[PDB]
């Protein structure tokens, strides 16, 4: 469908194609830097040792850190190497009391994310605790 082509599809339908969104960030970073590097030579601007050149470099670094933040976190939760991982943290009815057919069908991921936005930090903390317990068990 395209990079955000599944955005209006249901969560269930959109569980497919995860590979394109996962792939798009680093592909985009490399392609943009490549396009600039061989561009008709304007890097003298970067080499003016001005604030513009620094901001361009800062943007690249922060994009990398955001990427790694997510990978590092998946490593922490024990999900490294997978696009889809199951965990041992049970779902709380507090976060949502809607059923699986109710949410996986007839709702997009954008809608879902808004519905449970306020529980993001709680869930992430719980996922880390669960993995820590398993490291202790093994």
């Amino acid at each position: 469908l395209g990079f955000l082509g599944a955005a209006g599809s249901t969560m269930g339908a959109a569980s497919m194609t995860l590979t394109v969104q996962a792939r798009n960030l680093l592909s985009g970073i490399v392609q943009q830097q490549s396009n600039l590097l061989r561009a008709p030579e304007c890097q003298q601007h970067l080499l003016k040792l001005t604030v513009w050149g620094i901001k361009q470099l800062q943007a690249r670094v922060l994009a990398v850190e955001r990427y790694l933040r997510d990978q590092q976190l998946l490593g922490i939760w024990g999900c490294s190497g997978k696009l889809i991982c199951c965990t041992n943290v049970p779902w709380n009815s507090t976060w949502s009391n809607r059923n699986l057919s109710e949410i996986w069908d007839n709702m997009t991921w954008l809608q879902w994310d808004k519905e449970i936005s306020n529980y993001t930090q709680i869930i992430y903390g719980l996922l880390e605790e669960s993995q820590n317990q398993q490291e202790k068990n093994e």
């Binding site: 469908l1 395209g2 990079f3 955000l4 082509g5 955005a7 209006g8 599809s9 969560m11 959109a14 194609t17 995860l18 590979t19 394109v20 969104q21 996962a22 798009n24 960030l25 680093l26 985009g28 970073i29 392609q31 943009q32 396009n35 600039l36 561009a39 008709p40 304007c42 601007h45 513009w52 943007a59 994009a63 955001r66 997510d70 976190l73 998946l74 939760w77 999900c79 997978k82 696009l83 889809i84 991982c85 199951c86 965990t87 041992n88 943290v89 049970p90 779902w91 949502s96 699986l100 949410i103 996986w104 991921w109 954008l110 879902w112 994310d113 449970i116 869930i123 719980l126 996922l127």
Partner: protein
């Protein structure tokens, strides 16, 4: 027994603000050329998003603020290393330039002689000087950083494109007859914006996009009389502008290593600068606007177009800088009617308080020869002033409103691939 599943590659996003980068075509000495050096995509693409409802707010859109900040910065970078005109603050001895002129230009130009660290003379426009105590001084002689623009720099607008940095995306609203705010149902994702020419003007918006099959009127708040109203036309109105007088340029030495570019004698007769607007076209254009204005004022409500209001020249007359010279045109002939070949005289001046700042100004060196400009009127900036009759006047001066004319269908979002959902599945 539902469990938390973590998914990566989830197609979601949030409103976000970042710095967009500027791209340009192969053809881009121009002030924008250093900044916008990345080639645009040779074949730009968009992805339509089926069944996605998004929400826009053109009045709170940080694409507009970025364009505004970037344009000011570039103009200042360009002028930063150029000759300062402080040494020319000395009192001038001026005559009335009545040789071979029409009456409408009488006293408009002045022939000023002065001393330097040497007797020199040049011509000035009346609007750039102040009579004191034949003695004249520059209008902001002892108050501002008046500098000379370097003659080599082109300020001709070149369409530029804003492009998202990786990790970001620009969403575009394609709804026809879009209000500029609220929910939008025809949304596609794009790599970059369309090319936009960074055209600067007041009262009438020039060389923008046209509306499709309707005149669209947008404002932050339609009844609030403190807000400006932007009107986007579906047809352009052609305007021909000129400075018919054949000029010449001379340089003088004002200090060690410092030269000033002065206006020399005018070749041929001296007549007034002006712009031509087709009369019939303009009358139909106003009628279309009125038909649409009534939607918010009433079916039998009387609508009047008034000429102007008090204020600084840049916001009381139409302003544009075609050819590199600055024109201030009297638009009263365009807004003088009640609903229920027009020649606009123009004044020209060289010291410009660009961007409505105080204590800074740019001096525009004169252009040798004759200037002839052709441009498209694509929209208007109006302000609204017993319920029977509504009255509207031309407005402007806040440049954000011009940038917003094109950047109203775009918003920047950040992509966020991680999220969770419940499922019947445990490790």
């Amino acid at each position: 027994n539902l469990w938390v599943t973590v998914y990566y590659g989830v197609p979601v996003w949030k409103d976000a603000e970042t710095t967009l980068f500027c791209a340009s075509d192969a053809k881009a000495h121009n002030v924008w050329a250093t900044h916008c050096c990345v080639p645009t995509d040779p074949n730009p693409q968009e992805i339509h998003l089926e069944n996605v409802t998004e929400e826009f707010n053109m009045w709170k859109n940080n694409m507009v603020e970025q364009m505004h900040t970037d344009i000011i910065s570039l103009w200042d970078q360009s002028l930063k290393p150029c000759v300062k005109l402080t040494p020319l603050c000395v009192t001038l001895q001026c005559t009335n330039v009545t040789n071979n002129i029409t009456d409408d230009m009488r006293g408009e130009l002045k022939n000023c002689s002065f001393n330097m660290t040497q007797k020199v003379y040049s011509l000035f426009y009346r609007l750039d000087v102040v009579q004191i105590n034949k003695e004249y001084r520059l209008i902001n002689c002892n108050t501002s950083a008046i500098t000379q623009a370097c003659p080599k720099v082109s300020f001709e607008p070149i369409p530029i494109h804003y492009c998202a940095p990786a990790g970001f995306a620009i969403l575009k609203c394609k709804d026809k007859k879009f209000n500029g705010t609220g929910p939008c149902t025809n949304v596609s994702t794009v790599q970059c914006t369309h090319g936009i020419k960074p055209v600067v003007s007041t009262q009438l918006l020039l060389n923008g996009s046209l509306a499709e099959e309707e005149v669209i009127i947008r404002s932050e708040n339609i009844t609030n009389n403190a807000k400006n109203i932007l009107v986007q036309l579906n047809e352009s109105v052609q305007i021909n502008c000129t400075r018919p007088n054949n000029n010449t340029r001379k340089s003088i030495r004002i200090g060690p290593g410092q030269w000033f570019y002065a206006t020399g004698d005018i070749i041929g007769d001296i007549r007034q600068a002006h712009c031509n607007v087709s009369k019939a076209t303009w009358n139909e254009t106003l009628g279309k606007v009125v038909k649409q204005l009534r939607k918010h004022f009433g079916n039998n409500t009387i609508i009047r177009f008034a000429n102007s209001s008090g204020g600084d020249l840049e916001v009381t007359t139409h302003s544009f800088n075609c050819g590199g010279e600055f024109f201030y045109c009297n638009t009263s002939g365009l807004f003088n009617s009640t609903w229920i070949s027009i020649t606009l005289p123009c004044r020209i001046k060289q010291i410009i308080n660009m961007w409505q700042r105080i204590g800074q100004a740019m001096y525009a060196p004169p252009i040798q020869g004759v200037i002839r400009c052709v441009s498209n009127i694509t929209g208007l900036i109006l302000t609204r002033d017993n319920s029977t009759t509504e009255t509207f006047r031309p407005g402007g001066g806040d440049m954000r409103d011009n940038w917003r004319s094109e950047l109203y269908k775009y918003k920047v979002v950040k992509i966020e691939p991680l999220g969770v959902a419940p499922t019947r599945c445990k490790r």
